[PDB]
Structure 1
Amino acid sequence: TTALVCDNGSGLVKAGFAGDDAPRAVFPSIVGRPRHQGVMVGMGQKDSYVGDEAQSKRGILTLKYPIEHGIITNWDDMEKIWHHTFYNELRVAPEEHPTLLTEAPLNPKANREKMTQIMFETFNVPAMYVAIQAVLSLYASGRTTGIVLDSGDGVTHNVPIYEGYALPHAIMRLDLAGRDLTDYLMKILTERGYSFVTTAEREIVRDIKEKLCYVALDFENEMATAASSSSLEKSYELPDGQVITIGNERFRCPETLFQPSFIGMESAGIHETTYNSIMKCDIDIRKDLYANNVMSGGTTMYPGIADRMQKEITALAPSTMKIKIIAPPERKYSVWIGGSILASLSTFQQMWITKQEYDEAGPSIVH
C-alpha cells in the first residue's frame, strides 16, 4: 500500500519507499548490448544487460546511457529500465502506489509526458506528481530559504528559492558536469600516454575521478609549485595489473568547473553563474540568498569546495557580506531524503493527477 519515491538522474538511479532513510536500491542506470556473438548455449546470454550487471560485465558490452544531458535519448531503453526495476527488484506491485517523480528544472517538454504516459499505460500507477529536482534538495537540511546549487551528471541547476515561494525566472542551467568532466579527464590523461578510448573502459576513468581528486584554492600560483618534485601525485591501481600515476592534472581537471574555457564552451564558470543568477533576483532578498547556498548532487564530493567556492565568491560578491556555504555530508542522497519527506507529508496528495483526471485532458494538465 506504500508510495514510492523514485528519482531518475543520469546516475545512480535511486529507489526506496516513502521514507525513511536512503534509497533501498541504487545502480548505474545503464543498458549495454554485447558487441559480439555468443556461443555457449542456453541461450544463457541476455539480449541486453541492465544495471547492475551491466556494470559488472563491462568490455563485452556497449554501454548506452538511456538519458543524456537531461533529455533522454529514447524510451525504448528507459522503459526497460523501469519494467526491470519494478518487477524484478523492489518486488513491488504496479498498483501498489501513486508515485513521485523528478525531472530537470527546464527540460524540454514533452520529456515529462512520454514518461508519465508510457509509465501510465504500462504500469498503471493510479496517480502521479513530478516535483523539480532542485526544490527537493532543500528538504534535506529542512530549510525554507536559499539558492540551491545542484550539480549531478550531467545537468546542473542554480535555483533560488525564498521563504517560501520560488523565483522562476532567476534560474540558470549549465550543461557542464559531469560527463564533460569525465571526458575532459580522459582527454588530459592522454598527456601521460594512457589511452582510454572504448565505451566500457570510460567507466574506469570515472573511478579515478572518484578517489584521486581535490580542487586547489589558488590554482594559478599552485601550478608553479606543482612542478616541484614534491609529489602531489597519488598512484591508483587499475582493475588489471596496471599501475597508473596521475598528478598535476589531478587537481587541474576538476578546476574546469570554474573557467570552463578548457572545454571550449563560452558560458562562464559556476563561480560566476552563482552570483549572476543571484543578482537576477530582487535587490532586497539577496541578503539571505547569500550565506545559504546548500549544495547537492554527486559532483560536490570534491575535497576542494566549498572554501574554494567561498574565496572565489567573496572576490566577486559585494563587500561587507557574510557568506556561509552550508553543504551537508551524505549529499549524494540529499534529493532522495527530500522526496521521502514529501509524499509522506500532508497534504499535497491532492495536487496529484489520478486516473479519472487523465481520461479528460490527458497529455496536458501535467504542469
Structure 2
Amino acid sequence: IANQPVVIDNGSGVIKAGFAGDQIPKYCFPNYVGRPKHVRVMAGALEGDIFIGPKAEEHRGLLSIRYPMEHGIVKDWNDMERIWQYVYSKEQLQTFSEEHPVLLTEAPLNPRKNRERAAEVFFETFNVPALFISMQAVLSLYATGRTTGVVLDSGDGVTHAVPIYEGFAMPHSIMRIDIAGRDVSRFLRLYLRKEGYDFHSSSEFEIVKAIKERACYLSINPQKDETLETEKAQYYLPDGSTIEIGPSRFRAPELLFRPDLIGEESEGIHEVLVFAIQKSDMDLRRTLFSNIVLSGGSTLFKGFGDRLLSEVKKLAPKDVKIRISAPQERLYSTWIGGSILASLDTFKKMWVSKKEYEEDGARSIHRKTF
C-alpha cells in the first residue's frame, strides 16, 4: 500500500495540508477550535457546535476560540484530533486516513511524550499505514534546493535556528526560544491597552493578529525612534471604528530581538542565529554565515531582514560576508520541502510503518527520527 502520501505541516498559528509533489499547499487554515459562546434558540442554526477552518474565520464573534498548540507543544489533545479529523474530512481533503501514508512536522527539542502521543493518535484513532515525523529546518532547505546553511525560522509558537551542512542537521547547535508571533501579538494587545483600545475576548484577539500582520514595521535604530515622536497612523476595524495605533506598531515586533520587554530573559532571534553558528565548528562558520535562510510568518515584518543583518554585523566577527536569503513563499517553505521529501523514492525507507509500530512501539519512532 504505497499511495500518494499526505503532508500535514503542523504549526501553532496556521496549519498547512495537501498531497505530495505539489507546488503549493492547497489547504491552509488557522489551527484552532472555535466553539459557540451564545445559546442557540432558533432552529436552522450552525450545526455541530465545533468549528474549524473557514467557518470559524467567517463566524469569529460567536466562537470562544482556543488554540490547542502553544510553542509547538499541543496542550489540548482532543482538539488536535478534531483538527486532524477535519483535515482528512470531506470539507478539505476528501480522502481517507486508511489509504495514504502521513508526513508530519514538529519543532526541534520538543517533549518526547507529545511526539509519542502524536504517533498514538495517527496509528490507533486514525488507521495510518505509515507515519514519518520531521524537522522544519531540514524541509525548508529541501524546498530552496540547498544542502548547507542555517535556517532561522519565526512561526507563531517557536523561533529556532538549526545549522545544516551537506545534509547533516547538527543537533547540538540547535538554539530555541518560546518567543514568537503569538507572543508578539499578545505583547501588541498589552500595548494597545496602554494606548487606549482593549481587546479582552478570544474572538476579539484575532483583530490584534490582523493589526500585527498589516500595520507593524521593524525600525533599524530603536533608540532614535524612541526619541522622535510618532505620526499615529490609522486603522479600520471589522466594525468600522478608527484606531490611532501610535508607537505600539514599531515597539511590538521589538519583542523578538529584545525579549526583556515581555519579562523573560531570553536570547532573541539575532542572538539565536549567532549562537547557532558559534556552537557549530570553526571550519563550517563562514559557509553557515553565507547561507542563512528565513521562514515563518513572523519574519514578514517590514525591515526585519535589514535589522537582522545589522544585528549580525554587530555580533559576528568582522570582515565576513553576510547573506540572509529569503524565498518568495516563506509561509509555505516548510510544506514545499515536505512535499518534495515525500515525492522522493527514499521516503519509503525513512518512515515508520504500522506493523513496525505495533511490534516495537515508541522506541522505533525515536530511532527513525534520529
TM-score (ref. length: structure 1): 0.95
2:31 is matched with: 29
2:20 is matched with: 18
Check whether the contact 1:159–1:170 (CA below 8 A) recurs between aligned residues: yes
1:224 to 209, 224, 227: 227
1:327: Cα distance to partner? 1.1
Check whether the contact 2:71–2:178 (CA below 8 A) recurs between aligned residues: yes
Tell me, yes or no, if structure 1 residue 90 matches structure 2 residue 73. no
Secondary structure of 2:324's match? coil
1:146: Cα distance to partner? 0.7
The residue correspondences of 1:195-234 to structure 2 (distance < 5 A) are 195-225=198-228, 227=229, 231=231, 233-234=232-233
2:261 is matched with: 262
CA distance in 2, matches of 1:198, 1:43: 23
2:40 is matched with: 38
Change (3 A) 1:316 1:43: closer
Amino acid at match of 1:290: F
Secondary structure of 1:163's match? coil
CA distance in 2, matches of 1:210, 1:44: 29
Check whether the contact 2:25–2:335 (CA below 8 A) recurs between aligned residues: yes
1:317 is matched with: 316
CA distance in 2, matches of 1:265, 1:129: 34
CA distance in 1, matches of 2:271, 2:147: 24
CA distance in 2, matches of 1:364, 1:192: 52
How many matched pairs?
363
1:280: Cα distance to partner? 0.8
CA distance in 1, matches of 2:146, 2:78: 38
CA distance in 2, matches of 1:43, 1:331: 38
1:162 is matched with: 165
1:222: Cα distance to partner? 2.4
CA distance in 2, matches of 1:51, 1:36: 20
CA distance in 2, matches of 1:340, 1:351: 14
Secondary structure of 2:131's match? coil
2:8 is matched with: 6
The residue correspondences of 1:175-214 to structure 2 (distance < 5 A) are 175-214=178-217
Check whether the contact 1:30–1:55 (CA below 8 A) recurs between aligned residues: no
Identity across the alignment (%): 53
Deviates more, 1:31-40 or 1:288-297: 31-40
Check whether the contact 2:179–2:256 (CA below 8 A) recurs between aligned residues: yes
CA distance in 1, matches of 2:362, 2:285: 38
2:118 is matched with: 115
Deviates more, 1:28-37 or 1:291-300: 28-37
Unaligned residue ranges in structure 2 (runs of 5+): none
Amino acid at match of 2:13: G
Check whether the contact 2:107–2:135 (CA below 8 A) recurs between aligned residues: yes
Secondary structure of 1:294's match? strand
Check whether the contact 1:38–1:45 (CA below 8 A) recurs between aligned residues: no
1:42: Cα distance to partner? 5.0
Residues 99-130 of structure 1 deviation map (CA, whole Å, 9 limit, x = unaligned): 11101111101211111112212221201111
1:70 to 65, 72, 75: 72
Alignment RMSD, CA only? Answer: 1.4
Secondary structure of 1:182's match? helix
CA distance in 1, matches of 2:268, 2:118: 32
Unaligned residue ranges in structure 1 (runs of 5+): none
CA distance in 2, matches of 1:106, 1:52: 32
Residues 241-298 of structure 1 deviation map (CA, whole Å, 9 limit, x = unaligned): 2011213221111112111111100012222221122111111211111021101011
CA distance in 2, matches of 1:248, 1:41: 47
CA distance in 1, matches of 2:152, 2:17: 23
1:354 is matched with: 353
Check whether the contact 2:357–2:365 (CA below 8 A) recurs between aligned residues: no
Check whether the contact 2:150–2:292 (CA below 8 A) recurs between aligned residues: yes
Deviates more, 1:34-43 or 1:293-302: 34-43
CA distance in 2, matches of 1:271, 1:169: 18
Residues 37-83 of structure 1 deviation map (CA, whole Å, 9 limit, x = unaligned): 21113575422212221222122221111111221012211111111
Tell me, yes or no, if structure 1 residue 335 matches structure 2 residue 338. no
Amino acid at match of 2:72: G
CA distance in 1, matches of 2:87, 2:309: 41
1:355: Cα distance to partner? 2.0
2:155 is matched with: 152
Change (3 A) 1:252 1:84: same
Change (3 A) 1:43 1:310: closer
Amino acid at match of 2:108: P
CA distance in 2, matches of 1:190, 1:11: 23
